[PDB]
PDB file of C-alpha atoms in Angstrom:
ATOM      1  CA  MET A   1      15.116  79.128  38.307  1.00 45.89           C
ATOM      2  CA  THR A   2      12.782  78.516  35.273  1.00 47.94           C
ATOM      3  CA  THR A   3      14.903  79.464  32.398  1.00 50.36           C
ATOM      4  CA  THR A   4      14.928  79.632  28.519  1.00 52.60           C
ATOM      5  CA  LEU A   5      17.325  80.465  25.593  1.00 51.53           C
ATOM      6  CA  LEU A   6      18.082  83.415  23.911  1.00 50.60           C
ATOM      7  CA  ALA A   7      20.091  84.162  20.768  1.00 49.70           C
ATOM      8  CA  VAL A   8      21.970  87.150  20.608  1.00 49.60           C
ATOM      9  CA  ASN A   9      24.003  88.695  17.879  1.00 48.86           C
ATOM     10  CA  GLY A  10      25.341  91.838  19.119  1.00 50.40           C
ATOM     11  CA  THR A  11      26.388  94.116  22.302  1.00 52.18           C
ATOM     12  CA  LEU A  12      25.027  91.643  24.595  1.00 52.40           C
ATOM     13  CA  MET A  13      27.433  88.811  23.256  1.00 54.10           C
ATOM     14  CA  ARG A  14      30.909  88.008  25.672  1.00 52.19           C
ATOM     15  CA  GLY A  15      33.009  91.182  25.821  1.00 49.18           C
ATOM     16  CA  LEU A  16      30.967  93.698  24.317  1.00 48.73           C
ATOM     17  CA  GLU A  17      29.640  96.654  25.771  1.00 46.28           C
ATOM     18  CA  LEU A  18      26.102  95.587  27.080  1.00 46.09           C
ATOM     19  CA  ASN A  19      27.439  92.084  28.032  1.00 46.73           C
ATOM     20  CA  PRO A  20      27.412  93.323  31.538  1.00 47.81           C
ATOM     21  CA  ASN A  21      23.493  93.691  31.434  1.00 43.60           C
ATOM     22  CA  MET A  22      23.388  90.002  30.333  1.00 43.01           C
ATOM     23  CA  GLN A  23      25.565  88.743  33.103  1.00 39.17           C
ATOM     24  CA  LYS A  24      23.375  90.841  35.729  1.00 40.65           C
ATOM     25  CA  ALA A  25      20.046  89.119  34.329  1.00 39.82           C
ATOM     26  CA  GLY A  26      21.567  86.005  35.355  1.00 42.84           C
ATOM     27  CA  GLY A  27      22.282  84.980  31.668  1.00 38.41           C
ATOM     28  CA  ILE A  28      25.081  82.089  31.285  1.00 39.78           C
ATOM     29  CA  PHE A  29      26.739  81.361  28.231  1.00 39.25           C
ATOM     30  CA  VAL A  30      25.736  78.208  26.314  1.00 34.89           C
ATOM     31  CA  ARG A  31      27.515  78.302  22.959  1.00 36.75           C
ATOM     32  CA  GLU A  32      28.298  79.825  19.531  1.00 38.13           C
ATOM     33  CA  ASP A  33      25.609  79.171  17.061  1.00 38.65           C
ATOM     34  CA  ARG A  34      24.633  80.570  13.681  1.00 35.96           C
ATOM     35  CA  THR A  35      20.925  81.427  12.048  1.00 37.96           C
ATOM     36  CA  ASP A  36      19.598  79.457   9.535  1.00 37.88           C
ATOM     37  CA  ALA A  37      20.321  81.532   6.021  1.00 38.33           C
ATOM     38  CA  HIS A  38      17.708  83.762   6.175  1.00 35.13           C
ATOM     39  CA  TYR A  39      18.642  86.747   7.845  1.00 29.22           C
ATOM     40  CA  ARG A  40      19.742  90.010   6.823  1.00 28.88           C
ATOM     41  CA  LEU A  41      21.890  92.183   8.696  1.00 30.11           C
ATOM     42  CA  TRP A  42      22.985  95.967   9.567  1.00 33.83           C
ATOM     43  CA  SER A  43      24.860  97.731  11.310  1.00 33.90           C
ATOM     44  CA  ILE A  44      23.039 100.387  13.109  1.00 33.79           C
ATOM     45  CA  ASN A  45      25.097 103.775  13.447  1.00 37.39           C
ATOM     46  CA  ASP A  46      28.334 101.186  13.771  1.00 37.95           C
ATOM     47  CA  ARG A  47      26.849 100.982  17.638  1.00 36.15           C
ATOM     48  CA  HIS A  48      25.255  97.630  17.159  1.00 41.67           C
ATOM     49  CA  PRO A  49      23.821  95.138  15.031  1.00 41.56           C
ATOM     50  CA  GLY A  50      20.274  94.458  13.795  1.00 40.36           C
ATOM     51  CA  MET A  51      18.625  91.435  11.906  1.00 40.34           C
ATOM     52  CA  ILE A  52      15.602  90.578  10.218  1.00 38.38           C
ATOM     53  CA  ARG A  53      14.264  87.429   8.672  1.00 38.07           C
ATOM     54  CA  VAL A  54      13.538  87.481   5.126  1.00 36.93           C
ATOM     55  CA  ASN A  55      12.475  84.931   2.231  1.00 39.00           C
ATOM     56  CA  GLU A  56      14.876  85.844  -0.295  1.00 34.24           C
ATOM     57  CA  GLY A  57      18.190  86.830   0.207  1.00 34.49           C
ATOM     58  CA  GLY A  58      19.855  86.734   3.623  1.00 36.52           C
ATOM     59  CA  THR A  59      22.475  84.792   5.227  1.00 34.26           C
ATOM     60  CA  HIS A  60      23.557  82.627   8.080  1.00 32.95           C
ATOM     61  CA  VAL A  61      24.376  85.558  11.102  1.00 33.54           C
ATOM     62  CA  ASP A  62      26.540  84.337  13.823  1.00 35.00           C
ATOM     63  CA  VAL A  63      24.900  84.385  17.414  1.00 36.36           C
ATOM     64  CA  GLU A  64      25.614  83.297  21.093  1.00 38.03           C
ATOM     65  CA  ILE A  65      23.174  81.257  22.614  1.00 38.10           C
ATOM     66  CA  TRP A  66      22.733  82.356  26.499  1.00 40.41           C
ATOM     67  CA  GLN A  67      20.212  80.658  29.048  1.00 42.34           C
ATOM     68  CA  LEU A  68      18.477  83.404  30.927  1.00 40.03           C
ATOM     69  CA  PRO A  69      15.843  83.504  33.787  1.00 37.96           C
ATOM     70  CA  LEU A  70      12.551  83.919  32.534  1.00 41.18           C
ATOM     71  CA  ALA A  71      11.864  86.677  34.677  1.00 37.44           C
ATOM     72  CA  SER A  72      14.828  88.684  33.378  1.00 39.35           C
ATOM     73  CA  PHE A  73      13.513  89.149  29.724  1.00 36.23           C
ATOM     74  CA  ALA A  74      11.532  92.210  30.333  1.00 36.36           C
ATOM     75  CA  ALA A  75      14.147  94.155  31.882  1.00 34.89           C
ATOM     76  CA  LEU A  76      16.874  92.887  29.579  1.00 33.60           C
ATOM     77  CA  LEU A  77      14.468  93.945  26.589  1.00 33.08           C
ATOM     78  CA  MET A  78      14.028  97.511  28.278  1.00 31.12           C
ATOM     79  CA  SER A  79      17.654  98.060  28.538  1.00 28.87           C
ATOM     80  CA  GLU A  80      18.377  97.017  24.635  1.00 30.93           C
ATOM     81  CA  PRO A  81      18.995  99.866  22.160  1.00 32.67           C
ATOM     82  CA  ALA A  82      16.026 101.602  20.657  1.00 33.12           C
ATOM     83  CA  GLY A  83      14.194  99.340  17.831  1.00 34.60           C
ATOM     84  CA  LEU A  84      15.213  95.839  19.103  1.00 37.02           C
ATOM     85  CA  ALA A  85      12.668  93.237  19.846  1.00 39.58           C
ATOM     86  CA  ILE A  86      12.533  89.832  20.564  1.00 38.63           C
ATOM     87  CA  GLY A  87      11.059  87.007  18.815  1.00 37.88           C
ATOM     88  CA  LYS A  88      11.399  83.650  17.496  1.00 38.65           C
ATOM     89  CA  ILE A  89      14.452  82.496  15.163  1.00 40.23           C
ATOM     90  CA  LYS A  90      15.400  79.745  13.504  1.00 39.81           C
ATOM     91  CA  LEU A  91      19.212  78.510  13.744  1.00 39.41           C
ATOM     92  CA  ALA A  92      21.295  76.941  10.985  1.00 42.24           C
ATOM     93  CA  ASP A  93      20.559  73.252  12.691  1.00 42.21           C
ATOM     94  CA  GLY A  94      16.912  73.949  12.009  1.00 41.38           C
ATOM     95  CA  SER A  95      16.063  74.655  15.849  1.00 41.28           C
ATOM     96  CA  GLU A  96      13.746  77.399  16.666  1.00 42.63           C
ATOM     97  CA  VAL A  97      14.890  79.709  19.908  1.00 40.87           C
ATOM     98  CA  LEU A  98      14.216  83.217  20.994  1.00 43.83           C
ATOM     99  CA  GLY A  99      16.247  86.066  19.218  1.00 39.96           C
ATOM    100  CA  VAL A 100      17.055  89.682  19.267  1.00 37.70           C
ATOM    101  CA  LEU A 101      15.462  91.007  16.117  1.00 38.58           C
ATOM    102  CA  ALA A 102      15.446  94.497  14.645  1.00 37.92           C
ATOM    103  CA  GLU A 103      12.311  96.517  13.398  1.00 35.50           C
ATOM    104  CA  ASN A 104      12.039  97.568   9.994  1.00 33.15           C
ATOM    105  CA  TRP A 105      12.467 101.121  10.700  1.00 30.59           C
ATOM    106  CA  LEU A 106      15.604 100.938  12.402  1.00 27.44           C
ATOM    107  CA  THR A 107      17.834  99.653   9.384  1.00 23.96           C
ATOM    108  CA  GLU A 108      16.443 102.849   7.241  1.00 25.80           C
ATOM    109  CA  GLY A 109      19.480 105.072   6.485  1.00 25.49           C
ATOM    110  CA  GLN A 110      21.551 102.397   7.920  1.00 27.23           C
ATOM    111  CA  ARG A 111      24.565  99.830   6.014  1.00 25.81           C
ATOM    112  CA  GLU A 112      23.563  96.336   5.196  1.00 24.07           C
ATOM    113  CA  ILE A 113      26.361  94.038   6.497  1.00 21.79           C
ATOM    114  CA  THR A 114      24.713  90.822   5.819  1.00 23.60           C
ATOM    115  CA  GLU A 115      27.842  90.104   3.349  1.00 20.13           C
ATOM    116  CA  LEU A 116      29.974  89.663   6.233  1.00 21.05           C
ATOM    117  CA  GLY A 117      27.387  87.637   8.414  1.00 21.04           C
ATOM    118  CA  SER A 118      28.771  88.759  11.596  1.00 18.72           C
ATOM    119  CA  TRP A 119      28.899  91.591  13.852  1.00 20.58           C
ATOM    120  CA  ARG A 120      32.419  90.569  15.383  1.00 18.98           C
ATOM    121  CA  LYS A 121      34.048  90.188  11.729  1.00 20.98           C
ATOM    122  CA  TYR A 122      32.357  93.601  10.630  1.00 22.78           C
ATOM    123  CA  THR A 123      33.880  95.758  13.726  1.00 25.58           C
ATOM    124  CA  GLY A 124      37.120  93.540  14.342  1.00 25.14           C
ATOM    125  CA  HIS A 125      35.730  93.118  17.944  1.00 30.37           C
ATOM    126  CA  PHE A 126      36.841  89.312  18.464  1.00 27.78           C
ATOM    127  CA  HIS A 127      36.471  87.432  21.224  1.00 27.78           C
TER     128      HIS A 127
ATOM    129  CA  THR B   2       7.076  92.489  40.391  1.00 28.03           C
ATOM    130  CA  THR B   3       5.523  93.226  36.745  1.00 30.95           C
ATOM    131  CA  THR B   4       5.647  94.691  33.806  1.00 30.94           C
ATOM    132  CA  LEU B   5       3.177  96.494  31.324  1.00 31.92           C
ATOM    133  CA  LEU B   6       2.418  95.102  27.797  1.00 32.69           C
ATOM    134  CA  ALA B   7       0.377  96.495  24.927  1.00 31.53           C
ATOM    135  CA  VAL B   8      -1.639  93.802  23.246  1.00 31.10           C
ATOM    136  CA  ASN B   9      -3.642  94.610  20.168  1.00 30.26           C
ATOM    137  CA  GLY B  10      -5.378  90.949  19.279  1.00 32.36           C
ATOM    138  CA  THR B  11      -6.550  87.340  20.942  1.00 33.27           C
ATOM    139  CA  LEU B  12      -5.106  88.315  24.207  1.00 36.19           C
ATOM    140  CA  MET B  13      -7.606  91.108  24.764  1.00 37.84           C
ATOM    141  CA  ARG B  14     -10.474  91.223  27.268  1.00 36.90           C
ATOM    142  CA  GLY B  15     -13.105  88.299  25.972  1.00 37.48           C
ATOM    143  CA  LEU B  16     -10.710  87.011  23.137  1.00 36.51           C
ATOM    144  CA  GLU B  17      -9.495  83.689  22.919  1.00 37.39           C
ATOM    145  CA  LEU B  18      -6.048  83.664  24.602  1.00 37.87           C
ATOM    146  CA  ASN B  19      -7.442  85.714  27.306  1.00 36.53           C
ATOM    147  CA  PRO B  20      -8.120  83.509  29.959  1.00 35.42           C
ATOM    148  CA  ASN B  21      -4.615  82.375  29.719  1.00 34.69           C
ATOM    149  CA  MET B  22      -3.616  85.942  30.226  1.00 32.93           C
ATOM    150  CA  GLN B  23      -5.596  86.260  33.351  1.00 33.09           C
ATOM    151  CA  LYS B  24      -4.069  83.018  35.102  1.00 31.02           C
ATOM    152  CA  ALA B  25      -1.092  83.781  34.245  1.00 33.05           C
ATOM    153  CA  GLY B  26      -1.173  87.002  36.465  1.00 31.26           C
ATOM    154  CA  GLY B  27      -2.268  89.365  33.638  1.00 28.92           C
ATOM    155  CA  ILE B  28      -4.492  92.485  35.209  1.00 25.47           C
ATOM    156  CA  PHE B  29      -5.967  94.739  32.920  1.00 26.14           C
ATOM    157  CA  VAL B  30      -4.918  98.072  33.196  1.00 24.22           C
ATOM    158  CA  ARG B  31      -6.893 100.349  30.254  1.00 22.80           C
ATOM    159  CA  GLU B  32      -7.505 100.595  26.813  1.00 18.63           C
ATOM    160  CA  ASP B  33      -5.164 102.922  24.746  1.00 21.21           C
ATOM    161  CA  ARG B  34      -3.969 103.514  21.282  1.00 19.26           C
ATOM    162  CA  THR B  35      -0.480 103.949  19.642  1.00 16.63           C
ATOM    163  CA  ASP B  36       0.555 106.735  18.160  1.00 15.45           C
ATOM    164  CA  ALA B  37      -0.091 107.375  14.503  1.00 16.03           C
ATOM    165  CA  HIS B  38       2.491 105.248  13.325  1.00 16.95           C
ATOM    166  CA  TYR B  39       1.660 101.643  12.893  1.00 17.49           C
ATOM    167  CA  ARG B  40       0.313  99.842   9.975  1.00 18.60           C
ATOM    168  CA  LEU B  41      -1.981  96.681  10.898  1.00 17.97           C
ATOM    169  CA  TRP B  42      -2.361  93.171   9.166  1.00 17.79           C
ATOM    170  CA  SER B  43      -4.876  90.323   9.735  1.00 15.19           C
ATOM    171  CA  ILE B  44      -2.554  87.282   9.859  1.00 14.74           C
ATOM    172  CA  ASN B  45      -4.550  84.580   8.401  1.00 14.47           C
ATOM    173  CA  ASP B  46      -7.689  86.009   9.959  1.00 15.23           C
ATOM    174  CA  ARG B  47      -6.407  84.363  13.192  1.00 16.89           C
ATOM    175  CA  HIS B  48      -4.606  87.087  15.252  1.00 16.85           C
ATOM    176  CA  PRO B  49      -3.229  90.860  13.994  1.00 13.25           C
ATOM    177  CA  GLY B  50       0.140  91.847  13.575  1.00 13.77           C
ATOM    178  CA  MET B  51       1.509  95.431  13.609  1.00 12.50           C
ATOM    179  CA  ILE B  52       4.528  97.085  12.391  1.00 13.02           C
ATOM    180  CA  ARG B  53       5.810 100.842  13.186  1.00 14.94           C
ATOM    181  CA  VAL B  54       6.585 102.901   9.952  1.00 16.39           C
ATOM    182  CA  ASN B  55       7.759 106.510   9.429  1.00 18.52           C
ATOM    183  CA  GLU B  56       4.565 107.714   7.292  1.00 16.13           C
ATOM    184  CA  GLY B  57       1.567 105.786   6.104  1.00 17.80           C
ATOM    185  CA  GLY B  58       0.709 104.515   9.526  1.00 17.35           C
ATOM    186  CA  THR B  59      -2.609 104.938  12.083  1.00 20.23           C
ATOM    187  CA  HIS B  60      -3.565 104.586  15.437  1.00 18.44           C
ATOM    188  CA  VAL B  61      -4.062 100.929  16.125  1.00 21.72           C
ATOM    189  CA  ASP B  62      -6.602  99.990  19.558  1.00 20.30           C
ATOM    190  CA  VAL B  63      -4.350  98.358  22.230  1.00 17.36           C
ATOM    191  CA  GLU B  64      -5.278  97.088  25.904  1.00 19.62           C
ATOM    192  CA  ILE B  65      -2.304  97.550  28.459  1.00 21.63           C
ATOM    193  CA  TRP B  66      -2.001  94.618  30.805  1.00 20.85           C
ATOM    194  CA  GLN B  67       0.148  94.172  33.617  1.00 17.80           C
ATOM    195  CA  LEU B  68       1.942  90.976  33.847  1.00 18.67           C
ATOM    196  CA  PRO B  69       4.420  89.449  36.278  1.00 19.89           C
ATOM    197  CA  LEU B  70       7.855  89.236  34.665  1.00 17.22           C
ATOM    198  CA  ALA B  71       7.886  85.335  34.169  1.00 20.68           C
ATOM    199  CA  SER B  72       4.468  85.564  32.570  1.00 21.64           C
ATOM    200  CA  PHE B  73       6.079  88.122  29.999  1.00 20.97           C
ATOM    201  CA  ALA B  74       8.818  85.110  28.970  1.00 24.73           C
ATOM    202  CA  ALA B  75       5.832  82.868  28.620  1.00 27.22           C
ATOM    203  CA  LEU B  76       4.138  85.023  26.085  1.00 23.47           C
ATOM    204  CA  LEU B  77       7.463  85.454  24.323  1.00 22.80           C
ATOM    205  CA  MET B  78       7.557  81.435  24.239  1.00 20.77           C
ATOM    206  CA  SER B  79       3.512  81.083  23.347  1.00 21.19           C
ATOM    207  CA  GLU B  80       3.477  83.642  20.735  1.00 18.34           C
ATOM    208  CA  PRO B  81       3.328  82.443  17.203  1.00 12.81           C
ATOM    209  CA  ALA B  82       6.360  82.818  15.227  1.00  9.74           C
ATOM    210  CA  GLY B  83       6.735  86.192  13.402  1.00 10.63           C
ATOM    211  CA  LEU B  84       5.309  88.066  16.356  1.00  9.34           C
ATOM    212  CA  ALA B  85       7.996  89.698  18.583  1.00  9.25           C
ATOM    213  CA  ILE B  86       7.884  91.896  21.686  1.00  6.33           C
ATOM    214  CA  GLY B  87       9.625  95.220  21.170  1.00  3.18           C
ATOM    215  CA  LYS B  88       8.779  99.029  22.293  1.00  2.00           C
ATOM    216  CA  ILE B  89       5.895 100.811  20.862  1.00  2.00           C
ATOM    217  CA  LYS B  90       4.718 104.560  21.288  1.00  2.00           C
ATOM    218  CA  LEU B  91       1.006 105.087  22.387  1.00  2.00           C
ATOM    219  CA  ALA B  92      -1.287 108.314  21.272  1.00  2.00           C
ATOM    220  CA  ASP B  93      -0.203 110.111  24.613  1.00  2.00           C
ATOM    221  CA  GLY B  94       3.533 109.828  23.659  1.00  2.00           C
ATOM    222  CA  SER B  95       4.693 107.405  26.163  1.00  2.00           C
ATOM    223  CA  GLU B  96       6.302 104.430  25.522  1.00  2.00           C
ATOM    224  CA  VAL B  97       5.731 100.820  26.677  1.00  2.00           C
ATOM    225  CA  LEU B  98       6.553  97.011  25.725  1.00  2.00           C
ATOM    226  CA  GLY B  99       3.901  95.914  22.682  1.00  2.00           C
ATOM    227  CA  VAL B 100       3.416  92.911  20.507  1.00  2.00           C
ATOM    228  CA  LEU B 101       4.879  93.669  16.838  1.00  2.00           C
ATOM    229  CA  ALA B 102       5.033  91.657  13.975  1.00  2.00           C
ATOM    230  CA  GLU B 103       8.401  90.583  11.554  1.00  2.00           C
ATOM    231  CA  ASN B 104       8.003  92.000   7.915  1.00  2.00           C
ATOM    232  CA  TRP B 105       7.739  88.229   6.829  1.00  2.00           C
ATOM    233  CA  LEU B 106       4.610  87.417   8.374  1.00  2.00           C
ATOM    234  CA  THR B 107       2.620  90.064   6.615  1.00  2.00           C
ATOM    235  CA  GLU B 108       3.781  88.917   3.434  1.00  2.00           C
ATOM    236  CA  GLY B 109       0.422  88.256   1.354  1.00  2.00           C
ATOM    237  CA  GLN B 110      -1.551  89.133   4.417  1.00  2.00           C
ATOM    238  CA  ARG B 111      -4.572  91.452   4.314  1.00  2.00           C
ATOM    239  CA  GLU B 112      -3.452  95.233   5.567  1.00  2.00           C
ATOM    240  CA  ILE B 113      -6.531  96.534   7.697  1.00  2.00           C
ATOM    241  CA  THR B 114      -4.580  99.580   8.912  1.00  2.00           C
ATOM    242  CA  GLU B 115      -7.883 101.890   7.950  1.00  2.00           C
ATOM    243  CA  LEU B 116      -9.726  99.996  10.421  1.00  2.00           C
ATOM    244  CA  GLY B 117      -6.819 100.334  12.896  1.00  2.00           C
ATOM    245  CA  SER B 118      -8.675  97.496  15.207  1.00  2.00           C
ATOM    246  CA  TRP B 119      -8.814  94.045  15.547  1.00  2.63           C
ATOM    247  CA  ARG B 120     -12.184  94.098  17.285  1.00  3.71           C
ATOM    248  CA  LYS B 121     -13.733  95.851  14.203  1.00  3.39           C
ATOM    249  CA  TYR B 122     -12.412  93.828  11.851  1.00  2.28           C
ATOM    250  CA  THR B 123     -13.846  90.600  13.540  1.00  2.00           C
ATOM    251  CA  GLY B 124     -16.704  92.219  14.881  1.00  2.00           C
ATOM    252  CA  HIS B 125     -15.927  90.971  18.552  1.00  2.00           C
ATOM    253  CA  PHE B 126     -16.837  93.810  20.935  1.00  2.00           C
ATOM    254  CA  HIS B 127     -16.408  94.454  24.756  1.00  2.00           C
ATOM    255  CA  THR B 128     -19.052  96.644  26.543  1.00  2.00           C
TER     256      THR B 128
END
């Protein structure tokens, strides 16, 4: 009943493989959006993406904004792929929201897909 | 219902954000330490931030706290930008949620990995 917003960039998005976790958590889809131009994006084993905020380089990464009960965040995070965390991100409009981020270590040996800016575009999994 | 969180800084017993932790339903579980894979920074000498690394890290002292699910999300909302919650490994090999720093937040900041402890760095102890 008290809620806040979460920006997801990967498999929690509509129609993708972890979206049932989002639904079961009580998540409601709010809107499509994008980060500000300060994120680099990686494909983690071509299974899910991971993004990191940087000062130079980086681009706008496509996300979905979801509304979630406060009580649901812990379990949702626990169910997430290894190396993912939740912190604060900035959107293109300048607003701040919670978002799913990757730890540095998770990107080592992985393909950077920043130039595409979107997990959907990279995988060809459109909505 | 509750979750467990490893904290390494001002949320710990007797430190400046600890009363909020207590009033939000947090209960002290135990002292612990991470596995030998964390680097630690002082962020403007106001709070610490740690990052998991393959090589070059150490055991960082933490406290394990048990807190209600919604209080966990409240911390995601209140913690300063650049801090995030993800999964960490403890010295005993187990996994627990823990507060991490994003890379960007550490840039230019003092690394205090050798000390391995916010308490040792600030000289603020609990007996």
